[PDB]
Amino acid sequence: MVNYENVIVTEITETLTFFAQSVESGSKLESLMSKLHADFQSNPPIAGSYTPKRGDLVAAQFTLDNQWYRAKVERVQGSNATVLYIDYGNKETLPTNRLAALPPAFSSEKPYATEYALALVALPTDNEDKEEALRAFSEDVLNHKVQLNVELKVTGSPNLATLRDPTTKVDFGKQLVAEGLVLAEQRGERKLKELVDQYKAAQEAARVAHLAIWKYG
């Protein structure tokens, strides 16, 4: 009877945080991107006429496809800026001449992607084990429809969330633990006790089975 949210995972970072879009907001973003494309084709901005302050919400021309996206300026350094593509979750450093003022019409809708921390998962000690963990998790969830549950709200940073396969009901983060690819996190929130204990047992099973990072005990 847990109220799962149907999401699509759109971006995964190197610390196993991830960005997810709501499935029922898919048409909303689709419409926005189509209107933004048409707007900036009809009235293309003048390159170099805009420079941002840190925090500005802008239109940014993605270096990959030369299309315009909604973006938050996170850092400005001379001729370049670091931006977050708020509807998808990826970041890049970019010349400021590829930034323009976002028309107030596109600025009111909340970001269509939200960042979360994968609940109770810690990356392994080895660097190559780290890579494999990120590869394995991306293969599991990237671009896929999954069920998300927020486990803990965190003030000032991404909330803790589990991800579940809609068909098998397998907890993806826990599966990473059971496969011996990541470590289980121990923490004290009583509401997280059951999940903490379960992830601990999964880690233990992977240890006994000598899986992956636990190969040489």
Pairing mode of beta strands 80-85, 91-95: antiparallel
Q: Which amino acid would we find at residue 15?
A: T
Among 113, 142, 166, the domain boundary falls at 113
Question: CB within 8 A of 158, min separation 6: which ones?
Answer: 17, 115, 116, 117
Spatial contact of 9 and 141, defined as CB atoms under 8 Å apart: yes
Pairing mode of beta strands 113-118, 159-164: parallel
Are residues 49 and 9 part of one domain? no
Are residues 58 and 3 part of one domain? no
Q: How far apart are CA 161 and CA 164, in angstroms?
A: 10
Are residues 215 and 199 part of one domain? yes
Q: What is the resolution of this structure in A?
A: 2.1
Domain extent at residue 217: 1-22+114-217
Spatial contact of 135 and 123, defined as CB atoms under 8 Å apart: no
In the chain, the number of structural domains is 2
Are residues 91 and 14 part of one domain? no
Are residues 133 and 178 part of one domain? yes
